Symmetry: none
Subunit: 152 residues, 2 copies
Amino acid sequence: GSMALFSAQSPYINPIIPFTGPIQGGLQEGLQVTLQGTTKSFAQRFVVNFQNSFNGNDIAFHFNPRFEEGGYVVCNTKQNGQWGPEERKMQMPFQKGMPFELCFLVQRSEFKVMVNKKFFVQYQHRVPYHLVDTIAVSGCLKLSFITFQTQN
Amino acid sequence: GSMALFSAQSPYINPIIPFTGPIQGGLQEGLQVTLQGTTKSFAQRFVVNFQNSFNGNDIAFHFNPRFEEGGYVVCNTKQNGQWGPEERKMQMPFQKGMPFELCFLVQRSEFKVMVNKKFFVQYQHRVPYHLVDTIAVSGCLKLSFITFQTQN
């Protein structure tokens, strides 16, 4: 709970960072992509990208925690190799050397992002989400698994 | 051989069927769960379930030999009380009234299943395996022991 959830595809178990893998069928409404991992002890930044294809030219949603200037998270979109206007959440919900549950929920108008079961940010779709078929994870973290679940 | 193996937990010796017991720490990669037993002389079916908790609502892997319509084995997953698509191995590697060695090996992407030291089926993880902390065995069999071993 509070929702019943079903595997939408097989989990990636102990993925090695940097990780690039498919989201099979592309992102769909109601999908929860959950990353369970550990922020490194001397982390500077990490990145979770939801993107069309392996190139990283088109990133629907770039999630970029930065342990800099007090701690903040950047959310942005990249189109045809070009970054849009950043959305800076002036708070750091991750902690160096500590385990986290990072969950991305795909609604029709926005992504909702949960860190450790608590709501952290919303990010409104700038481009269509069904065109995302790739998750790329890199930077100062370790991961223990990634799950893909739906309410259907 | 061909591998050196170490107890990952104490064996269950002469467990009484139906049997429900813990997998301590949950399933982990490289674990071999070995059931040594006897198929009854008038067996219809038996079941080995790897599940989260005692309720049987969430069965990561359901292993269900059926001495029906020529003999076949069902492998399936149950989530939130709901069965997924079955995987039917159209072969029966058990024999009525006869002893068997049933061995389940946990790899990162799949379970490998050995019957009598020979490979029988593979079953790809539909849900994470570390969440399994319970083995449930029931149906038309007797067991002499269950072992849990790792290569570590």
